[PDB]
A paper describes a structure:
However, we were ultimately successful in creating a variant, designated as NeonCyan1, with a tryptophan-derived cyan fluorescent protein (CFP)-type chromophore, and two additional mutants with distinct spectral hues. NeonCyan1 has the ‘double humped’ excitation and emission spectra that are characteristic of FPs with Trp-derived chromophores in the neutral state, such as mTurquoise2 and mCerulean3. To obtain insight into the molecular basis of the empirically determined biophysical and photophysical properties of NeonCyan1 and its variants, we determined the crystal structure of NeonCyan0.95 at close to physiological pH (pH 7.5), NeonCyan0.95 at acidic pH (pH 5.6), and NeonCyan1-T207D at close to physiological pH (pH 6.5).
A late-stage variant, designated as NeonCyan0.95 (with Val67Ile rather than Val67Met), was used for structure determination by X-ray crystallography. Inspection of the NeonCyan0.95 crystal structure reveals the locations and interactions of all mutations introduced during directed evolution. The asymmetric unit contains four molecules of NeonCyan0.95. Calculation of the interaction surfaces between the various monomers (779 Å2 between monomers A and C, 439 Å2 between A and B, 312 Å2 between A and D, 272 Å2 between B and D, 272 Å2 between B and D, and 0 Å2 between B and C) strongly suggests that the symmetrical dimer formed by monomers A and C is physiologically relevant, while other contacts are likely due to crystal packing. The C-terminal MDELYK sequence folds into a helical conformation and contributes to the interaction interface. For example, there are two well-defined hydrogen bonds between nitrogen atoms in the chromophore and amino acid side chains. One of these is between a nitrogen atom of the 4-imidazolone ring and the side chain of Glu220, and the other is between the nitrogen atom of the indole ring and a water molecule that is part of a hydrogen bond network that also contains the side chain hydroxyl of Thr207. In addition, one face of the chromophore is closely packed with ionizable residues with side chains potentially bearing positive charges (His72, Lys153, Arg205) and negative charges (Glu45 and Glu220).
Numbering used by the authors:
A (entry chain C): 13 to 67, 71 to 235
B (entry chain A): 7 to 67, 71 to 236
Amino acid sequence: LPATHELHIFGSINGVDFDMVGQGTGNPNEGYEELNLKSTKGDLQFSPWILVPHVFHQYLPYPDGMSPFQAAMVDGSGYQVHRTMQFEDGASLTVNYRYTYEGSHIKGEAQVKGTGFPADGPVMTNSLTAVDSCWSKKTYPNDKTIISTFKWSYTTGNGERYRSTARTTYTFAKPMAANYLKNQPVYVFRKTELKHSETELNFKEWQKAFTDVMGMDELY
Amino acid sequence: EDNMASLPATHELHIFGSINGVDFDMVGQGTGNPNEGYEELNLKSTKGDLQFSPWILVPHVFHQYLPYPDGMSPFQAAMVDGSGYQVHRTMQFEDGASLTVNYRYTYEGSHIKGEAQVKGTGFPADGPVMTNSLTAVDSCWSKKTYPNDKTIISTFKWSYTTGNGERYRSTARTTYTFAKPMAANYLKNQPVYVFRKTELKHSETELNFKEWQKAFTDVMGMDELYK
């Protein structure tokens, strides 16, 4: 179970290179995590909001014990993550995650590639103001894979929603225990907070999983 | 087990009052699914164009539609018994504005008639409420406690989005007064967390409202997550 983490998040938005590193803590019994990120290449020339929710499900417990994300970390086996975001304006963003566990400390490597953002849109003009809390639906297509789907929205400087759909594929090196497979789908609620400058992000995230729940399809 | 399939599934609302002395009055018919926590409502002004943000009437525009994980909510139990409950909600805004809503219900058979008396005061004259420049609301959790056998107190943090993409924040407290004491399975099982999503399509004289709600019991780390 983890207490501390660090993130190296890097890549390009519309070919604009960015690199950010920082340290964080959390409570893996309550699904809380905190992160400070600093630009290693000066002022971000795009909305810092575009890095949310991408800026550690090792912090997410399940109702009656560890999440499969936690079980895989404790075992040492671990998991890789591929997220694809498809935006209402035709823009696309991909994030690849690689983790190492230097003790009870998680080291995150997040490779991001974003293309097709309109030059005068709110992402490239840094005019996004907020994000909404979000439900995700987690299914186990096989005993090695978790696919998470959610609908994501940013608020723009004009008070409109800037919408995207997301699919996250979790690939475990080692199968998930049998007693995870009997409980699907799994619905997770997440709230995030971001305080930011041009070079620094202060991120918080609260998350909670719900298992044998009826009438959650339209609601999520 | 409770006869959930038989619960009333039609309602009407008469919502009226004033916002900074701007009088309004709307009447409309709705339907829903009390087994799945879904309700729909159409409202039409009886006094022409609303001269403030229709968003200010959300979430105020029927917890008779809300089931509990193992049966009737107390709201539905009180309706089925016939004793019923009354509602008082206070919204306190970041700019010092305040809004109160008093609800009274009567059950004309399977049909719920709600009367919602609204008084909003203290809104800045050139703010987004009085100038009709609010654009949206967020989905919201509420926490319900039972301070005594005839009372439910619900608290939540509410936010509107403004024309500038900022949050216009309020804190809310809703007190439910039951004419008859609530059953044992309610009082021993607290607090209750309710997640709600709303949809609003509106003109200056007509609102089309939708709400989805789901109650959760015996949940652990909800203290900060629900806010």
